[PDB]
Design a protein around this nucleic acid. Structure first.
Ligand SMILES: [Zn+2]
Lengths: 92, 143
DNA sequence: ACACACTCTCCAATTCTCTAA
DNA sequence: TTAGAGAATTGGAGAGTGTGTTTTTTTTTTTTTTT
């Protein structure tokens, strides 16, 4: 056979390298200010998400990363279990 | 090995022949006619007059490249008079991330050495009657 | 024989559709 | 309304094939024999 293709998958997201890093650091990473423009602060938010997306899975263009995430995010039950777990933690 | 050892040799090395007063062929001078095909590979001594000298130019020994997408560096070693430069990042990590990145050459981390070429010719008072004088090509590197 | 240009082929990745809980 | 089972369409991996390559002045400085 030819070599099988490599893809983004929920296992990467649920890995310790994955989504927990964002929740462990996002409060410290991003910072808005009224003292800078909308365009300024708006640009700032995307920095962290871009660098994190590269570190996670360098295949593809940033937009493609988001739009790929939509499919697995809506379909996989284990990922959804993790997400309802987050919002239960806030219900705790 | 991570990189070729030639890339970090900061020095040059040369042999100096036997003193004839201690003496072996390397101590005994040959005229440019006596250098037969038997001597290929050996260390010898030659006596004559220099006819022309080239000016110095650089020659590559180890070439260095950068991969754009995965931010990784690779090296190539050159021995022959010509070479083909690399154009694909064959690194295993880069390959397993299916990252078909582009390679670009860099001078700032390549290794060069100084090169010069000359020619030597037999003394006119040693040419046998009715013949035309012969000559040899000399190469020089390093200090 | 050694880099190239071009052709051919198979296989699996993908999205679309139907069914039932 | 979600999701999972089956069918159809497309991409490009990669394997294969054929190919190409070595290789009469006219103007100007200098030596030589000729009138
Ligand atoms: Zn690379």
């Amino acid at each position: 056979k030819r070599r099988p293709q490599v893809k983004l998958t929920a296992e990467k997201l649920l890995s310790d390298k994955g989504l927990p890093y964002v929740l462990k650091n996002a409060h410290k990473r991003i910072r808005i200010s009224s003292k800078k423009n909308s365009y300024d602060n708006l640009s700032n938010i995307i920095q962290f998400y871009q660098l994190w997306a590269h570190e996670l899975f360098p295949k593809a263009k940033f937009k493609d990363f988001m739009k790929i995430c939509q499919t697995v995010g809506k379909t996989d039950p284990v990922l959804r279990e993790y997400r309802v777990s987050l919002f239960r933690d806030e219900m705790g | 090995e991570l990189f070729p050892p030639n890339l970090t040799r900061r020095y040059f090395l040369y042999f100096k022949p036997l003193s004839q007063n201690c003496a072996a062929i390397s101590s005994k001078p040959l005229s440019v006619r006596q250098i037969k095909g038997d001597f290929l590979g050996q260390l010898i001594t030659v006596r004559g007059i220099i006819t022309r000298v080239s000016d110095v130019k650089p020659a590559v020994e180890v070439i260095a490249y950068t991969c754009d997408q995965c931010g990784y560096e690779v090296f190539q070693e050159v021995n022959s008079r010509t070479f083909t430069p690399l154009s694909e990042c064959t690194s295993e990590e880069c390959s397993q991330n299916q990252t078909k990145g582009q390679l670009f050459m860099s001078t700032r981390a390549s290794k060069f050495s100084a090169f010069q070429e000359c020619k030597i010719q037999e003394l006119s008072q040693q040419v046998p009657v009715g013949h035309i004088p012969r000559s040899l090509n000399i190469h020089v590197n390093g200090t």
